[PDB]
Ligand binder design. Structure first.
Ligand code: SAH
Lengths: 257, 32, 223, 122
């Protein structure tokens, strides 16, 4: 009926979240006071995948800080930093057009979108039974995954999140893919839409085992971009506004410390 | 393809989608 | 021979079938097309938009509240317009304060945003429609970089839209529905529009006989 | 608007074709019950009736040469002429001119033969 055992199959499938890598040749960490107002060309060059892990300070979000969209144009992205690379950026409904126009001014061609459809944790809990911390949320999600054959008689349209927005109700999260040319991709290996059950507080802040899915999607877009130690000497993947303790191997993590 | 004439759902006038020229094919086959 | 008799009787049974259907047709039979609908059949590049404007201001006194558009993009089906031809339509004069819904394919996302801002609209939302199979799974289509399993309708707004004739946070921005015939759209986008604008004037361009609805002005070629 | 029932009729009258609309403004449901581009306008009906005066029931080449019914379909002419007389066959009235039909009433009132669908069976 629901087919939720197939919609959320990845959530339990053999997709283990990766552990943080130590400061060694398999990774690289950079600490900068400000990312937009700093020269990023010296940290790396000839990149072909740049993931901007940006959390925007939009009016829909209930006054919990973040980046400013008007400062994105201040960011300098020279041709030396990448020549032909795909740029991934976290979008919001308020600033989609501004992001598109800024990436056009910088020389990037909008190519693709990626969407996460959000289901409610409380809705699934109520369907199964009848200020939470990270550990409590994780264990509640494991519980919901365990009892996946109980709520299969429900209707999916009753499980979606309905977040506030002056026009509609938010149910998805958006990742924009822009292209620049001056890469031997594998094309259609990941679906354009994914399903995820999440808490209703900060659905924008993609958590672990969801950010891991995004990392795997980005890494399988470019199979030739794998950083095999020894044969190569420079990392060809970069992330801005990364996590201070979780260092993904093969990536250059830039921390706004 | 006698049964293929009405295999598809045509409008009530187009249901003779091939019978139109059969209206004269029958005449010519009656001639010889 | 025998095939002659078989074809004769087949033709006969169709003849009385057609006679019965036409007898019911010329007796007051109702069609699937609803009443209270305004089906203009014309060419959009040749339509006298001044006549439509005058009719709208004469019968209603004000322009449309929601304009849905499904442009025939010149990506390659058989009756399509060009980007500048679609841009040249007097959309600026058909609406003062309200929303515009444009079903934008992936190849025409950027030009859709450009046209939306050219006509004087602020890009404020977009609705994603996700395609479902008969069982309830996700439908898979051809992809450019990722397997396309959804389609986007960009929503721009212009003018004073806080008149009280529109509603906030009406419903989800996701439409999880089954894939019907080619180029067709789900019927609950109209329900979401009614939730957005209850009892308002709506205009659809490049409409078809499937899209005919109550309280709806539908302009089309094959319509 | 406030009273949409008159508004839709007025818009149909002032913007829609005379085939799609009606004199008062109501929908021509007979137009929407058939495929687009294949409709039997009353103009075609009177054209066929006048063609009966011109040549009558028979071969259908000269009736489509002057094209009284514009770009009409021959089998549609030989089929819709049956409903003029109310008989499923036209072998009794081949190659003759008819002023007044006179056949609808007599063939419709035939209790001995079939009265189904306002017609007379073989
Ligand atoms: N000037 C024009 N040139 C090409 N198509 C036009 C047109 N004016 C109206 N159309 C309509 O646009 C349609 C194609 S757009 C795609 C199909 C339809 N609009 C839908 O999505 O429901 C055609 O069926 C045609 O009837």
């Amino acid at each position: 009926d629901n087919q939720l055992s197939l919609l959320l199959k990845w959530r339990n499938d053999k997709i283990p979240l990766k552990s943080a890598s130590e400061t060694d040749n398999k990774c690289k960490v950079v600490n900068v006071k400000n990312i937009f107002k700093s020269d990023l060309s010296k940290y790396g060059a000839n990149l072909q995948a740049l993931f901007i892990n940006a959390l925007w300070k939009v009016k829909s979000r209930k006054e919990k800080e973040g980046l400013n969209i008007n400062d994105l144009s201040n960011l300098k992205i020279p041709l030396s930093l990448m020549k032909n690379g795909i740029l991934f950026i976290w979008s919001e409904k308020e600033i989609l057009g501004q992001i598109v126009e800024i990436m056009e001014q910088k020389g990037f061609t909008y190519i693709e979108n990626f969407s996460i459809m959000f289901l409610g944790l409380n809705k699934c809990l109520q369907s199964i039974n009848h200020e939470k911390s990270i550990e409590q949320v994780t264990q509640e999600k494991k519980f919901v995954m365990n009892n996946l054959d109980i709520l299969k008689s429900t209707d999916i349209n009753n499980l979606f999140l309905r977040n506030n927005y002056p026009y509609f109700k938010k149910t998805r999260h958006t990742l924009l893919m822009f292209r620049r040319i001056g890469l031997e991709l594998r094309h259609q290996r990941t679906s354009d839409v994914v399903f995820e059950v999440t808490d209703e507080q900060d659905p924008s802040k993609v958590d672990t085992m969801m950010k891991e899915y995004v990392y795997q999607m980005i890494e399988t877009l470019l199979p030739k971009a794998q950083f095999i130690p020894g044969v190569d000497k420079h990392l060809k993947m970069m992330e801005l506004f990364a996590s201070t303790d979780n260092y993904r191997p093969g990536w250059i993590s830039v921390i706004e410390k | 393809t006698l049964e293929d004439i009405e295999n598809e759902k045509f409008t009530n006038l187009e249901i003779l989608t091939h019978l139109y020229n059969l209206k004269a094919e029958i005449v010519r086959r009656l001639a010889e | 021979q025998g095939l002659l008799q078989d074809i004769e009787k087949r033709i006969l049974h169709y003849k009385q079938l057609f006679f019965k259907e036409q007898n019911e047709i010329a007796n007051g039979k109702r069609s699937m097309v609803p009443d209270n609908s305004i089906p203009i059949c014309s060419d959009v590049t040749k339509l006298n938009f001044q006549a439509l404007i005058d009719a709208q201001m004469r019968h209603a006194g004000k322009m449309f509240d929601v304009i849905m558009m499904d442009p025939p993009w010149q990506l390659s089906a058989y009756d399509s317009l060009s980007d500048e031809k679609i841009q040249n339509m007097p959309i600026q004069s058909l609406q003062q304060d309200g929303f515009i819904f444009v079903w934008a394919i992936n190849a025409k996302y950027r030009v859709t945003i450009k046209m939306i801002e050219n006509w004087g609209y602020k890009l404020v939302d977009e609705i994603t429609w996700v395609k479902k199979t008969v069982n309830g799974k996700i439908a898979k289509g051809h992809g450019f970089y990722l397997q396309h399993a959804k389609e986007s309708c960009l929503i721009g707004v212009k003018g004073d839209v806080d008149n009280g004739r529109f509603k906030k946070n009406i419903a989800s921005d996701v439409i999880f529905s089954e894939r019907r015939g080619q180029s067709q759209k789900p019927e609950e986008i109209y329900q979401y529009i009614n939730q957005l604008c209850p009892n308002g004037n709506y205009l659809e361009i490049f409409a078809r006989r499937n899209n005919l609805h109550d309280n709806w002005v539908s302009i089309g070629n094959e319509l | 608007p406030l009273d949409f029932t008159q508004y839709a009729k007025n818009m149909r009258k002032d913007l829609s074709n005379q085939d799609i609309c009606l004199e008062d403004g109501a929908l021509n449901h007979s137009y929407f019950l058939t495929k687009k581009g294949q409709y039997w306008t009353p103009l075609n009906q009177k054209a066929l009736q006048r063609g009966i005066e011109l040549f009558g029931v028979g071969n259908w080449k000269e009736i489509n040469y002057d094209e009284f019914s514009g770009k009409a379909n021959i089998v549609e002419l030989e089929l819709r002429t049956c409903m003029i007389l109310g008989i499923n066959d036209i072998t009794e009235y081949y190659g003759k001119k008819i002023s007044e039909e006179e056949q609808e009433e007599i063939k419709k009132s035939n209790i001995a033969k079939g009265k189904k669908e306002n017609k007379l069976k073989d």
